[PDB]
Every structure is written in C-alpha cells, then in structure tokens.
Scaffold this active site. Structure first.
Site, PDB file in Angstrom:
ATOM      1  N   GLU A   1      -2.705  11.350   2.979  1.00 33.26           N
ATOM      2  CA  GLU A   1      -3.828  11.228   3.912  1.00 33.26           C
ATOM      3  C   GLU A   1      -3.947  12.605   4.508  1.00 33.26           C
ATOM      4  OE1 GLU A   1      -2.590   7.828   6.202  1.00 33.26           O
ATOM      5  OE2 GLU A   1      -4.642   6.996   5.866  1.00 33.26           O
TER       6      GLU A   1
ATOM      7  N   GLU B   1       0.877  -1.158   0.000  1.00 28.95           N
ATOM      8  CA  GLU B   1       0.000   0.000   0.000  1.00 28.95           C
ATOM      9  C   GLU B   1       0.932   1.232   0.000  1.00 28.95           C
ATOM     10  OE1 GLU B   1      -2.978   0.204   2.987  1.00 28.95           O
ATOM     11  OE2 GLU B   1      -2.898   2.443   3.060  1.00 28.95           O
TER      12      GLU B   1
ATOM     13  N   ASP C   1       0.423   5.315   0.342  1.00 26.50           N
ATOM     14  CA  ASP C   1      -0.518   6.448   0.563  1.00 26.50           C
ATOM     15  C   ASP C   1       0.115   7.652  -0.096  1.00 26.50           C
ATOM     16  OD1 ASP C   1      -2.037   4.678   1.970  1.00 26.50           O
ATOM     17  OD2 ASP C   1      -1.307   5.425   3.869  1.00 26.50           O
TER      18      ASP C   1
END
Ligand SMILES: [Mg+2]
Ligand SMILES: [Mg+2]
Length: 278
Positions: free
Chosen positions: A135, A130, A132
């Site tokens: 965020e 994953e 990101d």
C-alpha cells in the site's frame, strides 16, 4: 521471466498467464481481468473500469476521478480503476512493477490478494484472507508516528470465525503477526519499483526492488485469493469511523477541496506477474 528475489533458490517457478500481464496491448484483457461486478466492496468510492483504466505503450494507468458536478452516486463522490484477476491462487509468488500517484496524499496505489467471505466455516477457521503486497502513499498514523510519502505498508488482514461471529483481525490489533511498515530511500510516487510477495503454507515474505523487507508466519492466509491492482481513496477524501472509510464531500472540507485541483490522478503499472512453485 522469474521472481526478482525468492527465499529458496532451490524452488522452481512457473509463470501463470491467468494473472500475468505485461500490458503490451492497448485493449485491456477483460477475459483475464474482471471489468465490472465482482469488485471489492468500497464504501467510499466506486469503480469505473471503462473510464478509469487505459493502457498505453506498455503501461497500464489506473485513475481516480471526481464525479461530474460533485454529484454523489450511492453516497460517494469519486470513481477509480482496478485490475482484479478472475483466477484465484493461494500459494505462489506475486510481483508488480508500479509507480505511484502525483497527488502525494489522498489516494493509495495498492497491489494485493484477497478472498471472498465464507461465513460458513467452523469455529477458529478463516472467513476472509487478504495479503497486501504493498500500500503506497497512505500516510498512515500508527502509535503516535505520522507516515509521509516515503513510508509504505505491507499488511495482512483476516476475518476469523469466533463464537459464531466473523471477527476482524486487523494489523494494528495484531501488529507482530500482521503489520509491516517499510521506509524507502526514494519517493514511490515518482518512479517505478518492484513489489513482490512470496506466499507459502508456512510464511509470507515481501520484497521491494528485490530486497526482502518483511516476513510473517502464515497463520490465516490459506484461502484462494484474487490478484488485485487498484487505486484507493484516502484522507482528506475519506474519514475513518466504524472500521471503514466514510466518504467526505470534497465541497464541505477545505483540505479535500484544495486537493481537487490534483484530481484526476493516476497510478501506473508496467507488469503484473504470478508464478506457482513446481
Ligand atoms: Mg500498451
Ligand atoms: Mg509493460
């Protein structure tokens, strides 16, 4: 259109329409974006793209809504919206122009890439990858520092097979390898900004408004990942235990109840663009 900023001007970039969208059409493109079914496991809310995705005048709107009557559905009290590409990618450049949500604290507008879980892989290999890209508005607490609305997180997450088990490698456990924080000089919830990530076999580099803000070696992030824009739920509507968000009934908690006046709340996306290096 090209990546706002890249690490090597000698690279050539080709736009990939299978996960790029300027949102100029009011009819969401459900051939390109997964409307239902194959969406992230969320223990704290559910997705309802029919009710929570709307596109108007060039801008997609993803909305967190409170369930009618405060009636739980499978342990959860809110629904949200998500653009998840059907198409997977590994290396490339990923960019979205996003404005955050007017609630301030309680939701997390996010742009991120994630794979499926492959628990069949060999010892030491990656089960789950994953990245990101950003965020926003998480108000994360880390080592005695409480974040506020100007702070954002740009973290990597993986599960790696170890002694038979898939072991989570979390940013706060491996912060030099996986945690990135950046403080903006503007409130991300009030205007649109450009969030970018360049991913290659060697490194992952993140950009905000065309400025490099972080870079990490690419240790685990070599699996095919889906390109994702979503609006997550956060405290005071969830509470962390057992490495997962647990839903809070917003009628049992004062902070959650008083934030209900600020629901529904929405993130907005002007475009998402993906390129591959040629
Ligand atoms: Mg439109
Ligand atoms: Mg647009």
């Amino acid at each position: 259109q090209q990546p706002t900023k890249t690490s090597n001007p000698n690279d050539q970039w080709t736009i990939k329409w299978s996960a790029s969208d300027e949102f100029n059409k009011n009819d969401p493109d459900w051939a390109k974006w997964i409307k239902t079914g194959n969406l992230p496991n969320t223990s704290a809310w559910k997705w309802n793209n029919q009710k929570n995705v709307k596109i108007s005048n060039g801008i997609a709107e993803l909305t967190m809504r409170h369930n009618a009557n405060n009636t739980p559905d499978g342990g959860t009290y809110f629904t949200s919206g998500i653009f998840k590409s059907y198409q997977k990618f590994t290396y490339g450049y990923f960019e979205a122009k996003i404005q955050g949500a007017d609630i301030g604290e309680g939701v997390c507008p996010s742009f991120w890439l994630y794979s499926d879980f492959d628990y069949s892989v060999a010892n030491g290999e990656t089960v789950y990858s994953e990245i990101d890209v950003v965020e926003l508005q998480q108000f994360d607490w880390y080592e005695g520092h409480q974040d506020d609305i100007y702070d954002m997180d740009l973290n990597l997450h993986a599960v790696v097979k170890e002694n038979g088990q898939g072991v989570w490698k979390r940013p706060k456990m491996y912060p030099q390898e996986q945690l990135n924080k950046w403080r903006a000089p503007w409130d991300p919830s009030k205007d649109f900004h450009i969030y970018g990530c360049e991913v290659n076999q060697n490194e992952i580099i993140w950009y905000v408004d065309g400025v490099e803000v972080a870079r990490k070696p690419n240790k685990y992030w070599h699996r095919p990942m889906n390109v994702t824009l979503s609006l997550g739920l956060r405290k005071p509507f969830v509470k962390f235990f057992d490495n997962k968000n647990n839903a809070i009934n917003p009628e049992t908690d004062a902070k959650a109840r008083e934030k209900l006046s600020d629901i529904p709340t929405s993130m907005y996306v002007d475009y998402v663009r993906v390129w591959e290096k040629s």
